[PDB]
């Protein structure tokens, strides 16, 4: 298991524009196109992201290309963020993947706001961090995925993705 396979499990693969769990136009492996309610705006973002007139449909290779860019961007966001970087650097590789997963789903600024959870992770108080992470809109709106990510933080294993 690795961050790419973990996110493929959590995000799926769809080759036509679809609405994500929040109702926002998305394609591929959880590539958010826009929060605009305009499908035309989403189609314009997609063509810009892919570099051709897609008419709302992409190939698997194209979806994987955006996915690799999006994972890269999530990691970059962590490393440039004054609050996320020290936590990330303190973690082992498995728990690092859990943090990348959160940033992929909610964004750098969103995860950086989890001040008390981040502190508990920095302190390696894993059960306490897991309890705190679940007191969140994130957990309530996507509980099955949040449970997998939280288990990964709690145990430092891939058990929840087996």
Q: Which two tokens stand for residue 143?
A: 């509980």
Q: Say whether 104 counts as a known binding-site residue.
A: yes
- For the chain, how big is the Rg over CA atoms in Å? 16
Q: Which two tokens stand for residue 7?
A: 């996110």
Q: Which residues pair with 138 in a beta bridge?
A: none
Q: Say whether 116 counts as a known binding-site residue.
A: no
Which helix H or strand E contains 26, and what residues bound it?
strand 25-28
Angle between helices 60-80 and 3-11 (to 10 degrees): 120
Count of other CB atoms within 10 angstroms of residue 108: 20
The answer to whether residue 92 is catalytic is no
Name which of 51, 53, 12, 47 is nearest 33 in CA terms.
47
Q: At 155, phi and psi to the nearest 5?
A: -105, -20
The answer to whether residue 5 is catalytic is no
Given the residues 10, 11, 62, 70, select the one marked as catalytic: 11
Q: Say whether 136 counts as a known binding-site residue.
A: no
Find tokens 């860019």 and name the residue: 69
Given the residues 5, 10, 20, 61, select the one marked as catalytic: 20
Q: Say whether 38 counts as a known binding-site residue.
A: no
Give the residue numbers marked as catalytic. 11, 20
Binding residue ranges: 32, 104, 117, 132
Binding residue ranges for substrate: 32, 104, 117, 132
């Amino acid at each position: 298991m690795n961050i790419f396979e973990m996110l493929r499990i959590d995000e799926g693969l769809r080759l036509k524009i679809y609405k994500d769990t929040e109702g926002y136009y998305t394609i591929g492996i959880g590539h958010l196109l826009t929060k605009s309610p305009s499908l035309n705006a989403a189609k314009s973002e997609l063509d810009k992201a892919i570099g051709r007139n897609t008419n709302g449909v992409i190939t698997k290779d194209e979806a994987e290309k955006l996915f690799n860019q999006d994972v890269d961007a999530a990691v970059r966001g962590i490393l440039r963020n004054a609050k996320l970087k020290p936590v990330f650097d303190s973690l082992d590789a498995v728990r690092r993947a859990a943090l990348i997963n959160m940033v992929f789903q909610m964004g750098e600024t969103g995860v950086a706001g989890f001040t008390n959870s981040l502190r508990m992770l920095q302190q390696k108080r894993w059960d306490e961090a897991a309890v705190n992470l679940a007191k969140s809109r994130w957990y309530n709106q996507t509980p099955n995925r949040a449970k997998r990510v939280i288990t990964t933080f709690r145990t430092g294993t891939w058990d929840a993705y087996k």
